[PDB]
Amino acid sequence: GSSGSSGDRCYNCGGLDHHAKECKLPPQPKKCHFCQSISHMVASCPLKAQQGPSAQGSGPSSG
Ligand SMILES: [Zn+2]
Ligand SMILES: [Zn+2]
């Protein structure tokens, strides 16, 4: 049917043309927008820069 979004724009400066990600400006001092790690930021977040391009089954288990 006819569905859409309320309007998702760059939650940093307010750019509609570009996306928050593409945006260049520095990310607000808010909490990490990756792992909700209020401690560190998304710029330092280690997980973000995870090492290992290998994406062939990652320990397939439950619980
Ligand atoms: Zn922006
Ligand atoms: Zn993080």
Side-chain angles (χ1 to χ4, degrees):
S2 302
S3 305
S5 193
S6 61
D8 37 71
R9 73 266 171 149
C10 166
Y11 80 108
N12 197 39
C13 74
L16 302 169
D17 64 274
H18 70 253
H19 311 335
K21 176 271 197 282
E22 292 288 76
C23 200
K24 299 189 91 268
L25 300 167
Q28 280 320 305
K30 296 177 75 87
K31 72 170 156 74
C32 182
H33 80 104
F34 186 69
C35 68
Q36 290 205 88
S37 160
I38 58 171
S39 177
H40 69 231
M41 281 76 241
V42 70
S44 285
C45 190
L47 299 161
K48 169 149 270 80
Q50 193 75 252
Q51 59 191 279
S54 68
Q56 288 67 251
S58 59
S61 66
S62 271

